[PDB]
Design a protein around this nucleic acid. Structure first.
Length: 394
RNA sequence: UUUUUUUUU
């Protein structure tokens, strides 16, 4: 199968170190019933999978009615949409042959081989069905967050695939076996691979690296009673001491963030061409789009960037021209008193996965200086390494 | 005597 590619996007095909590993994906699409592949983002996994499975012999495997076509599920609607104006142009075919579906935009075209999903739309489709005949190649995204809907869907697809791992008809050879790879976002999914519950077999796994684009991890053995002022001091020390760039100041809630915005408008009130060139912007997804496009833009000249954000920045929104974080130390979380029906908004330990993703959010392609207001001994006491499931709270 | 970071149909 050929793709009708383009020049700069063939530059985007070869550059990824997973396309040369295509044969593994080939055996992963030909040998194993369920495959688990992990890796940090930016290593060319979602931006390389449609070129795998459009060229795998699965677009027309069980042809001529097209029941072999890949659905790749995404954490959220904007991830699928942005990735569709990213890599549906990577396969050189129009919107009929590559597409997406989100909560309120359905692009159900019959020519399609690659479809980017959320969780809920595919739930909608296979409570509308139960045996998943129209699909044969499925790729999962974000296996490390372990949300509600990802876990729900993976349990019920384990049921459906292991029901179709059996014989389709009265002992045929034409089985509607479903080929599925979980393209993870961070490199610990083995907490599910050890179990014999969701699959009694051990699911075969593949581990791939990424491009670090280095970040310097720095621990401050400091009291973290008012982590706002500590983050303020670390970002002032980077802004004055270290070479220029952009620095991230991270917090938890609604009020400390605008308090830090007021302060960085106070001690650095100039923002035009105390000659510290600085533009300071808050960020969380409870802000309107005009401020959300204000951070999409680059800083005005005579001013660097500095972003006072909550814990949104790890996964929700990420911006190009930043270098360094000062972490939250402790992040805001929510839990329910099941003995009462009492909810809660509180602040507790950042797990090491969220902090690592945060440090990666700092050093996109440039140097990172992860000035952590907490210590290594406090990073010793940020167990567990990964975050706890979002199921257990609600 | 308001104290909502976050999310999937």
């Amino acid at each position: 199968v050929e793709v009708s590619r383009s020049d700069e996007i063939q530059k985007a095909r070869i550059q990824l170190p997973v396309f040369g590993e295509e044969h593994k994906i080939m055996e992963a699409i030909h040998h194993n019933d369920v495959v688990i592949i992990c890796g940090e983002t930016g290593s060319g996994k979602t931006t390389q999978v449609p070129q795998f499975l459009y060229e795998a012999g699965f677009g027309a495997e069980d042809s001529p009615d097209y029941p072999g076509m890949v659905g790749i599920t995404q954490p959220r609607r904007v991830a699928a949409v942005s990735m569709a104006e990213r890599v549906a142009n990577e396969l050189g075919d129009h919107g009929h042959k590559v597409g997406y579906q989100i909560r309120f935009d359905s692009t159900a075209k019959e020519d399609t081989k690659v479809k980017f999903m959320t969780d809920g739309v595919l739930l909608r489709e296979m409570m509308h069905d139960f045996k998943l005949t129209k699909y044969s190649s499925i790729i999962i995204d974000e296996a490390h967050e372990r949300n509600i809907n990802t876990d729900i869907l993976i349990g019920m697809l384990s049921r459906c695939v292991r029901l179709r791992a059996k014989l389709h008809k009265e002992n045929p050879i034409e089985h509607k076996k479903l080929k599925l790879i979980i393209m993870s976002a961070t490199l610990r999914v083995s907490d599910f691979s050890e179990n014999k519950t969701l699959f009694p077999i051990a699911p075969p796994v593949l581990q791939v690296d990424a491009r670090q684009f280095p970040v310097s991890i720095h621990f401050n053995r400091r009291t973290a009673f008012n982590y706002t002022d500590e983050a303020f001091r670390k970002t002032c020390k980077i802004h004055q001491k270290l070479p220029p760039g952009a620095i991230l100041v991270f917090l938890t809630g609604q009020q400390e963030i605008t308090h830090m915005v007021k302060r960085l408008r106070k001690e650095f009130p100039f923002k035009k061409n105390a000659n510290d060139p600085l533009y300071v912007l808050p960020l969380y997804s409870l802000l309107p789009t005009k401020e959300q496009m204000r951070v999409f833009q680059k800083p005005p000249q005579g001013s660097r960037l500095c972003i006072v954000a909550t814990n949104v920045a790890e996964t929700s929104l990420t911006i190009p021209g930043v270098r360094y974080v000062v972490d939250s130390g402790r992040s805001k979380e929510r839990k329910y008193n099941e003995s009462n029906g009492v909810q809660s908004f509180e602040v507790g330990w950042v797990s090491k996965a969220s902090a690592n993703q945060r440090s990666g959010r700092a050093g996109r392609t440039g140097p990172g200086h992860c000035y952590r207001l907490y210590s290594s001994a406090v990073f010793e006491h940020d167990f567990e390494q990964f975050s706890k499931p979002e199921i257990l709270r609600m």
